[PDB]
């Protein structure tokens, strides 16, 4: 092949991740490299293991090979052992999160996605980024992934992180990753679970044609929220690019006044806590 196969009989599958809330993916050991890593199970496979081969970056999870031995498929990467963004987010322990981590973590996902879009050998448009198909590495570095899942060619309850041309089924530009990656922000500022509760459908309906976005806190500093606004922007081609997002960034991390402001919003969930849980209160009942 032109891409490294894995036989299924040196593979030692331990659990299911996240007890199957992320799909048919493994924590497993490669037996004969001793190294452990993941298996994404799969029926089939079309030909991502020839894209999978020529991406690599700090900020997106390693391709180590293929499982081709019918019926048995599937795609083995590196196991980033802090688990999901999602799950940390919404754990306590995400308490510990200031200004330079929602910093650098911001950072790191912009350049694994501008990575993806403009310097891989091949352009890859995510097209499904959420804060569950991103995962942290052992070293506290955050890591893209199932960027694959499409096979890249579009197949074959996450309206949340759907930007309205992905949720109709419209011509798609890069720019759709940059309304999800808006989304993962407002997750890592927030704390909280974007439209819980809410129904998929009342997403989608909300979103598309009421221009319906997460609720901002008015504590929240403008600089992330102007942010926020620019990467949900409804006309699709106003939205920045990666390489913009990763410019805006570092202003951001050279104004002095931002840490200040960040940290007490941060530290301030007391308070804006129902600003959120008041929007939602109010989406939940113009459905019931
Ligand atoms: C190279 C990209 C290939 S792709 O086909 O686009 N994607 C693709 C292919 C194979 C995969 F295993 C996965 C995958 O899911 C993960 C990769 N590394 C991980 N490390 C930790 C966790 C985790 C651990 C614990 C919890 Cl509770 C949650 C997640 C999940 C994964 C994947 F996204």
Not at 49 to 71: C, D, K, M, T, W
Not at 167 to 190: K, R
Request: hydrophobic content about 40%; proline content about 4%.
């Amino acid at each position: 092949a032109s891409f490294v196969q894995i036989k299924f009989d040196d593979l030692q599958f331990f659990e299911n991740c996240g007890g199957g809330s992320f799909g048919s993916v493994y924590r497993a050991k490669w037996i004969s490299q001793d190294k452990e890593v993941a298996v994404k199970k799969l029926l089939k496979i079309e030909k991502e293991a020839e894209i999978l081969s020529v991406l690599s970056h700090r900020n997106i999870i390693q391709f180590y090979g293929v499982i081709l031995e019918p019926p048995n498929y599937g795609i083995v990467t590196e196991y980033a052992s802090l688990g999901s963004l999602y799950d940390y987010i919404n754990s306590n322990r995400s308490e510990e999160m200031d200004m330079d981590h929602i910093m650098t973590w911001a950072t790191d996902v912009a350049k694994g996605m501008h990575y993806l879009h403009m310097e891989a050998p091949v352009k890859v448009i995510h097209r499904d980024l959420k804060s569950r198909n991103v995962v942290i590495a052992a070293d506290g570095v955050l890591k893209i992934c199932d960027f694959g899942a499409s096979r890249f060619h579009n197949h074959t309850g996450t309206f949340p992180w759907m930007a309205p041309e992905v949720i109709q089924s419209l011509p798609v530009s890069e720019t759709c990753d940059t309304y999800s990656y808006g989304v993962v922000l407002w997750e890592m500022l927030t704390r909280e679970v974007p439209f819980k509760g809410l129904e998929g459908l009342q997403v989608a309906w909300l979103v598309v044609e009421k221009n319906e976005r997460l609720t901002i806190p008015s504590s929240c500093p403008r600089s992330f929220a102007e942010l926020l606004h620019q990467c949900w922007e409804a006309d699709a081609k106003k939205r920045p690019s990666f390489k913009q997002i990763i410019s805006i960034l570092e202003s951001m991390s050279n104004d002095t006044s931002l840490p200040d402001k960040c940290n007490s919003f941060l530290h301030n969930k007391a308070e804006w806590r129902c600003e959120i849980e008041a929007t939602l209160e109010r989406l939940k009942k113009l459905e019931r």
